[PDB]
Amino acid sequence: MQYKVILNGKTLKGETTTEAVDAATAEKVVKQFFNDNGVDGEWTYDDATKTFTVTE
Amino acid sequence: MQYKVILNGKTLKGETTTEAVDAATAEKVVKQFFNDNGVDGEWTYDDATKTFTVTE
């Protein structure tokens, strides 16, 4: 199933969607996302659109 | 200024927006987001909408 994850922060806000057999799997899959995005992830920047693309 | 951050993963995909004086500040602010969301963040779930809300 598909789940809609909301990344609501103070200086950062957004919406994302992970696909997992269940909410837990999704929750876990998401954890891996941030777990890997966190502070050692590969962040690419696109000045052309002032947008950054965090690729797992 | 406002920046549009794209969280593009394999099993997870989405879009977010951080506000920072510059791209770097934004990038840094975002890092704090994931840095704090990562594996020890406070994740709240809303079954009513199958949506999770990660609050910094």
**Domain count of the fold of chain B:** 1
Closest CA to B9 of A14, A9, A53, A11: A53
In the sheet with A42-46, reading across from the earlier edge strand, the strands are A42-46, A51-55, B2-8, B12-19, A12-19, A2-8, B51-55, B42-46
Burial of B21 (0-12, 13-18, 19+ CB in 10 A): exposed
Cβ atoms of residues B33 and B17 within 8 Å: no
State the smallest CA–CA distance between residue B1 and chain A in angstroms.
10
Cβ atoms of residues A54 and B5 within 8 Å: yes
Cβ of B7 within 8 Å of Cβ of A4? The answer is no
Pairing between strand A12-19 and A42-46?
A: unpaired
Q: In whole angstroms, give the CA distance from residue B27 to residue A45.
A: 9
In B1-56 the beta strands, taken as DSSP E runs, fall at: 2-8, 12-19, 42-46, 51-55
The structure tokens 């502070």 sit at A39
Cβ atoms of residues B7 and A14 within 8 Å: yes
B44 touches chain A (CB under 8 A): no
Which CATH number does the domain housing residue B26 bear?
A: 3.10.20.10
Phi, psi values for residue B13, rounded to 5°: -145, 145
Chain B hits for A27, Cβ within 8 Å: 43, 45, 52
Report the structure determination method: NMR
Q: Find the domain containing B55 and state its range.
A: 1-56
